[PDB]
Amino acid sequence: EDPQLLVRVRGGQLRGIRLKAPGGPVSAFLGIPFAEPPVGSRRFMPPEPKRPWSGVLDATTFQNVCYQYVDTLYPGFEGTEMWNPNRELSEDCLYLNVWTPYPRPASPTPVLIWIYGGGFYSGAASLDVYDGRFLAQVEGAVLVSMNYRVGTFGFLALPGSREAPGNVGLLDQRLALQWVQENIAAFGGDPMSVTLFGESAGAASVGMHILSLPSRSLFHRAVLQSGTPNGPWATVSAGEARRRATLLARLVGCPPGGAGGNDTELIACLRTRPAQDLVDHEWHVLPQESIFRFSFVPVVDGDFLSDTPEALINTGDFQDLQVLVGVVKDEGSYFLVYGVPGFSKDNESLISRAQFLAGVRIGVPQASDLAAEAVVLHYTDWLHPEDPTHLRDAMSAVVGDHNVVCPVAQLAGRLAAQGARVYAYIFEHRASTLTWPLWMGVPHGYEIEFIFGLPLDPSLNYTTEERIFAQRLMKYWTNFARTGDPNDPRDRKSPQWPPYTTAAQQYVSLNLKPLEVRRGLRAQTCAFWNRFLPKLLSAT
Amino acid sequence: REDPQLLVRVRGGQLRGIRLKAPGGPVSAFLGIPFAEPPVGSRRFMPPEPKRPWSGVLDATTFQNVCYQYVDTLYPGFEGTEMWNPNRELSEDCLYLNVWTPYPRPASPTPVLIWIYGGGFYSGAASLDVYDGRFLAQVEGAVLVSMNYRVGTFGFLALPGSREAPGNVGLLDQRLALQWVQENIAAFGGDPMSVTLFGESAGAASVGMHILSLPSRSLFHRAVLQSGTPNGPWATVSAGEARRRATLLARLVGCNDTELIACLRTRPAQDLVDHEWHVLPQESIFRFSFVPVVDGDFLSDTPEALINTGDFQDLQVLVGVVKDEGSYFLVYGVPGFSKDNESLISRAQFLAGVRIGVPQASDLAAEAVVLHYTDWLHPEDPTHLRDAMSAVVGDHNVVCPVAQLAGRLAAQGARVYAYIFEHRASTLTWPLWMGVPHGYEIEFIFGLPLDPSLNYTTEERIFAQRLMKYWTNFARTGDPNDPRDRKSPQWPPYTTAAQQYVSLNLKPLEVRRGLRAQTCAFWNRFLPKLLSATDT
Ligand SMILES: C[N+](C)(C)CCCCCCCCCC[N+](C)(C)C
Ligand SMILES: C[N+](C)(C)CCCCCCCCCC[N+](C)(C)C
Ligand SMILES: *[C@@H]1O[C@H](CO)[C@@H](O)[C@H](O)[C@H]1NC(C)=O
């Protein structure tokens, strides 16, 4: 047929499809099974390498989304729907995608592996905003985006157990990585320049790979957008993981009656429950009412993660590492409508003070009273402690800083200090297209469109600057991808992006106006969160 | 034959004053008038008993003894330090007051201004050149009274509940002086119905105490608290602490409460002064040995309690603070600070100094403080660190307690006026790094720049006038604003809602909202909870 859309892989033949990007043709190999479907008695189990196949495996289309909760908060609303599954749900979802430029690159092009985010409970490479055709067509890079097990399926764990040891949604990603290694070669990809890049929980994931030895040998560069492995939401202890597994199990009738004491039977029992049964009780295992906290996520097992990601970034050796890190203007905005009284995407959410005080307890569930006070002290504007507008924006700040920004900063600094070559940024441009209210500004995850290059598509209603902007962004990423320096290669155009350093603390303003270097990532505020607050908590 | 204008008859007898010359004219001055029987011998530690009547004409032309106290020998010969030291023979017999009126004495009853001097309750005197009534008297026509009150062990050593050493006597001395004015001030042309109290540091604390003590409250109508409050970390002590110290000091000099006080009364006054500092419990600064005890008598409850639950509708108050309240004190106990160099310190000193400045803090409380006052972008910059250490001490001990008091008073009916003094005396002898320290506003209020003999500038003289106008207008009408003269900058009341105060500097008045708002919420609201959580 066409040697361009026909490829032999370590397991067998494949057939891609030829996509048409604004600037030209692209080869796309969608739905490549990287592992044997983790269904049946394989559920909660580490993934296994897909067995070799006979004939030509079709790969002209997107596979099934892993089993996960579907958002029903705002039915029909693009702002939420855009994140929901666009393919059928199934426990048989272990496939990855590959975009290569048409025709295949002359020599070993650098590879950009994307890891989607969604609180470790949702997400899919199948998504529109994760369309890696532009970054291949335009920047000529080999882009790979895989699907990994979310929710209970990916992270339910009974630490120490043989049949649900946890973190399998990560081993999924790791397995996709080992694949890209021994197989990307055939797509014109360089198995020597693997640059991982993900947002939210994907970012947190990327971090996990950096912190996990076995994952090291599978990548060389890393980008962590709006998320880290060290936060208050990305991991749970062994005890908590268990307490939530058993509880979820219990709710689903596992085991039935007053029988118990055997984890194997407990999992065996769980393995028989319809997928939707688990998803039904996913949210009932949280210990307190909250936001930006997820039920099933990576666990500190002492295997995939040898110790807390905190303890790891604190004492790891990141000398050789080259990382790109960042954040958006208002991380915490999106999460407010999902459980904080007074907040809706429909009104301006001009909240009362009491609403704000309550909100603080939700957004910071692990906080004792005194610690809550501290947070209130810090975020209240005492000249106007009643102004609804402040209270509103302050709530978004508490959430966004606590969960994303400060942890980012804590990582960046701890990384740089450890030997890493870190680069930081603050995405501040609010897409014109954006359907969420003005009050949320630049919400968690609204940088993707630009990094992926969606504004390049003419049909989509993006402004010309946004297009130029997107290209600029794609440039930084791909540049960081090949070189390990997001800067205009040789061609020293103009503004330079300096490495974030402990002493200097430099990050850049990623927006319409050319680069604009700044110092201190909420330095003051994050000193509160990263230095003080912790000891306030470990006292109370 | 006598000058009819300098001969005054007072309840205890007659007295002759002296005609003084102020820059713009003559002024009458009656100095060293006794208002109490000499608190000596067995009268030591005891409350003041009224001055017994005398015969003949008492000589009220010269200042009297300064109350027995400690003398500041830190920087021998240094004006900025000596300007506060005793300028008359020390003696226990020091209970006298001074009145300054225009010359000739005013025809119409004029508003009285009563000055209570600073000095951390361990020192001070009305004898001091900075507390000179002559300018206020001559330029504004005020009747200015100022008294001496016992300090240190003599005026504040307490064995709560005993008869022979009840404590707070120095505060009683001031009250007695306040009564004396009530009675006798009419004789000089003063109006007993328009008494306005004003003080600085411990002086302002004392003023606050009179506001919070019922008896004293019916002896004045308005008040001005300059860089000082009744509430706050240093102004008062528990009854148990007061006793811990008193008992300790007693033991330190070789001494049943009665039998103890008896022994302390045989000790030479200097023996006491020498040991008064040995009783402090911790390595600190801006923390004094013998201050007002909360006896449940003069002070029914704590000033904190009292300002939170009191009626203050019938009160007009002027409160303020100078731009660099902390500096002066760093020099006294925080390593790395000297008047001689620029005192740029290392983060290590800043850290060890916060424990000096907030001696009562727990490691966590301290760390909370450190976190607040650090510039995390340059946590090592000695300049910022130096400036910051000064703010910790100023905010903790003065600025915030003032903001607290302003809010509580305002909240509970009072009419409050607030300011921040920002001008640095051109003639200032303290290093430029100390900015406008604690006490360097006084000389302007009292009108010293009006004396051409002193080397102030023309602007400074004009400034002094403006301030004297502010104070007197307030002492006169409860409002510091120029009445008829709807001039230019109008000074609005501090309200809990708007939180406005003004800038007292060479430029015209400027209104500012929120007095160290965010920082004071840390000290006032949060720090205490954290403090109690981590307490002993
Ligand atoms: C922004 N994306 C999507 C890319 C990543 C964010 C994932 C976190 C979603 C927060 C809302 C959780 C709501 C939980 N429920 C629906 C159960 C209330
Ligand atoms: C300017 N006036 C006279 C109105 C106020 C003077 C206040 C004196 C400050 C002394 C601080 C001592 C601190 C404790 N140690 C002994 C450690 C220095
Ligand atoms: C916004 O709307 C939600 C639900 O419609 C409501 O709970 C909230 O009180 C509203 N807030 C304002 C400020 O209108």
PDB file of N, CA and C and ligand atoms in Angstrom, chain A residues 342-344 347-351 355, ligand 3:
ATOM      1  N   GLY A 342     -20.908  28.759  47.348  1.00  0.00           N
ATOM      2  CA  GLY A 342     -20.800  30.124  46.873  1.00  0.00           C
ATOM      3  C   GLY A 342     -20.211  30.212  45.478  1.00  0.00           C
ATOM      4  N   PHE A 343     -19.604  29.119  45.026  1.00  0.00           N
ATOM      5  CA  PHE A 343     -18.986  29.102  43.704  1.00  0.00           C
ATOM      6  C   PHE A 343     -19.751  28.350  42.619  1.00  0.00           C
ATOM      7  N   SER A 344     -19.928  29.048  41.501  1.00  0.00           N
ATOM      8  CA  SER A 344     -20.610  28.554  40.312  1.00  0.00           C
ATOM      9  C   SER A 344     -19.988  29.240  39.097  1.00  0.00           C
ATOM     10  N   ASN A 347     -22.558  32.500  38.021  1.00  0.00           N
ATOM     11  CA  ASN A 347     -22.554  33.850  38.603  1.00  0.00           C
ATOM     12  C   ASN A 347     -21.089  34.266  38.807  1.00  0.00           C
ATOM     13  N   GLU A 348     -20.857  35.449  39.357  1.00  0.00           N
ATOM     14  CA  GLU A 348     -19.484  35.882  39.575  1.00  0.00           C
ATOM     15  C   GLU A 348     -18.868  35.318  40.853  1.00  0.00           C
ATOM     16  N   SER A 349     -19.623  34.469  41.542  1.00  0.00           N
ATOM     17  CA  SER A 349     -19.151  33.839  42.764  1.00  0.00           C
ATOM     18  C   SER A 349     -18.576  34.820  43.776  1.00  0.00           C
ATOM     19  N   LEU A 350     -19.236  35.959  43.940  1.00  0.00           N
ATOM     20  CA  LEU A 350     -18.782  36.944  44.919  1.00  0.00           C
ATOM     21  C   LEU A 350     -19.243  36.443  46.284  1.00  0.00           C
ATOM     22  N   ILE A 351     -18.369  35.685  46.930  1.00  0.00           N
ATOM     23  CA  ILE A 351     -18.661  35.074  48.216  1.00  0.00           C
ATOM     24  C   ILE A 351     -18.589  35.919  49.499  1.00  0.00           C
ATOM     25  N   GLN A 355     -18.340  32.085  54.019  1.00  0.00           N
ATOM     26  CA  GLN A 355     -18.219  31.132  52.921  1.00  0.00           C
ATOM     27  C   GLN A 355     -16.745  30.853  52.739  1.00  0.00           C
TER      28      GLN A 355
HETATM   29  C1  LIG C   3     -24.102  31.271  42.570  1.00  0.00           C
HETATM   30  O1  LIG C   3     -24.988  30.198  42.163  1.00  0.00           O
HETATM   31  C2  LIG C   3     -24.959  29.029  43.034  1.00  0.00           C
HETATM   32  C3  LIG C   3     -25.946  28.003  42.448  1.00  0.00           C
HETATM   33  O2  LIG C   3     -26.759  28.548  41.408  1.00  0.00           O
HETATM   34  C4  LIG C   3     -25.310  29.404  44.498  1.00  0.00           C
HETATM   35  O3  LIG C   3     -25.103  28.283  45.361  1.00  0.00           O
HETATM   36  C5  LIG C   3     -24.468  30.588  44.989  1.00  0.00           C
HETATM   37  O4  LIG C   3     -24.951  31.000  46.265  1.00  0.00           O
HETATM   38  C6  LIG C   3     -24.519  31.762  43.976  1.00  0.00           C
HETATM   39  N1  LIG C   3     -23.646  32.847  44.403  1.00  0.00           N
HETATM   40  C7  LIG C   3     -23.887  34.109  44.038  1.00  0.00           C
HETATM   41  C8  LIG C   3     -22.884  35.136  44.545  1.00  0.00           C
HETATM   42  O5  LIG C   3     -24.853  34.447  43.337  1.00  0.00           O
END
